[PDB]
Amino acid sequence: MLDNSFYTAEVQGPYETASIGRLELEEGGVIEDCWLAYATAGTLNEDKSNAILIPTWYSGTHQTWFQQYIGTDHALDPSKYFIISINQIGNGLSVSPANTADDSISMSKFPNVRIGDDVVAQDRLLRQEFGITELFAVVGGSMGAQQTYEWIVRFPDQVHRAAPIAGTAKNTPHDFIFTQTLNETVEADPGFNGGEYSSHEEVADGLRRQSHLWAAMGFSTEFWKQEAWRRLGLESKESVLADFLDPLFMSMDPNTLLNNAWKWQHGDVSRHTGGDLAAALGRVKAKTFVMPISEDMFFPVRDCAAEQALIPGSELRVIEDIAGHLGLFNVSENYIPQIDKNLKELFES
C-alpha cells in the first residue's frame, strides 16, 4: 500500500467503501476481495425506482460530479433522485494496484480490468447494498460513457434512461493510439521502475508529460487560440500547465492511470454480439441521449453520431464547448446549462 493524499476523502470528498466479494475478470484475472468506493446523495423511494448511477472517468472520481454536476439547482437533483457514483476498479479510490492488501495483485501484478468488469461489479454493489435492481438513469462522461453504454447493452432491461457524454460504445483505433502515447510517456520515466515505484512522486516527470499530452489533445486549437483558459483566472498558457494541469496529473498514481487506460483502450460493447456493433446497440431499450462535445478531438461528434444512428429511439444532443473533451471539467460558462437542459429533458422521457 502507498500513501497518496490525493486519493483521500479530504481531496475527493466523502465516500464509502464496500466489498462485493470475489470478482472473476473477463480477461482471466481474479480479484478475491473486490471492494468499491462510492458516494451517494438523496433518498431512494419506496419502489427504489429513482436511482441514478454515475460511473467515473479516467483519472477522475466521484468528485467532479458532486462538485459541478449535482445539486438541487441541477438536473441531477438529490431532492428527487437517489444519486450514486461508483468509482472505477483500479481508479485509486476503489480497489487498485496501489491500495490493495492482496500481495498477489499488488502494483504491477494488478490484473487487466475491462469496462464489462466494472458494470458487473456495479450491478452487484447496487443489489447488495441498496437492493437496486433497475436504474432510473445512467449518466457518465468519457470512460463513464463507455460504462454507460456497457450498462444498456449488457443489462438492457435494468436501465430506463442513458446519457453517454463525450464517449463511445466501441473504442476507435485513433483513441487507442492516443491513449498509448499517454501510457508510453509514464513508462518512459525511469522512476516508474516497472510499476514498482515507492511513491508517485518518483514518476513526476512522466506524469507532467502526460499532462502536456492532455493539453494537446484534451481541449481544442480554438481553446488555446482564443485563450479561453483566461476564465480560470490564469495569465499565460504556460501557467495553465504549471499551475493547473500539471499539478493535477502529478498528484495521481501511475499504476491507476495505466490500469484504467488499458480498460479505456479495450472498451467494446460489441463483444456481447460477436463483433456486430449494430446488433449490440440494437439491444438498447433505455431512452438514450448521445451527447458528444463539439470540439472534442478524440471523441469527436462524428464518432458519437455514427453510434447514435444505431441506437433505437435515441437522440443526438451535441454539447457546444470550445474546451473540447476537458469541457467535462466545467471550464466554460454555458457547459452545465447545456448539460442540465438535456438531462432534464431526458429525465422527462
Cα(95)–Cα(88) distance, integer angstroms: 9
Q: Does 305 bind a copy of itself (CB under 8 A)?
A: no
Residue type, 267: G
Which of 164, 175, 141, 159 has the alpha carbon at shortest distance from 307? 164
CB of 211 to Cl ion, least distance (A): 15
Q: Which of the following is catalytic: 59, 85, 106, 142?
A: 142
Residue 215 binds to a copy of itself (criterion: CB under 8 A): yes
Stretch that binds a copy of itself, among 16-24, 99-107, 139-147, 167-175 (CB under 8 A): 167-175
Binding mask 237-266 for a copy of itself (x = CB under 8 A): x---x-------------------------
- Out of a copy of itself, Mg ion, Cl ion, none, which partner does residue 104 contact, by CB within 5 to 8 A per kind? none
Which candidate, 60, 146, 149, 76, places its Cα nearest to that of 339? 76
Least distance (Å) from Cl ion to the CB of residue 325?
A: 8
Among 190, 166, 197, smallest CA distance to 308 is for 166
User: Distance of CA 310 to CAs 94, 169, 212, 293, 302, Å?
Assistant: 33, 11, 35, 19, 13
Active site residue 314: no
> Which one, 62 or 209, has the nearer CB to a copy of itself?
209
CB of 185 to Cl ion, least distance (A): 17
Return the C-alpha cell found at 208: 507532467
User: Is residue 71 a contact residue for Mg ion (CB under 5 A)?
Assistant: yes
Spatial separation of the C-alpha atoms in residues 166 and 293, rounded to whole Å: 6
Q: Which of 117, 118, 325, 332 is catalytic?
A: 325
Per the CB < 8 A criterion, the answer to whether 108 and 197 are in contact is no
Q: Which is nearer to Mg ion, 68 or 273 (CB)?
A: 68
Reduced to 3 states (helix: H, G, I; strand: E, B; else coil), residue 54 is strand
Among 181, 199, 334, 349, binds a copy of itself (CB under 8 A): 181
State the minimum distance, in angstroms, from the CB of residue 74 to Mg ion: 5
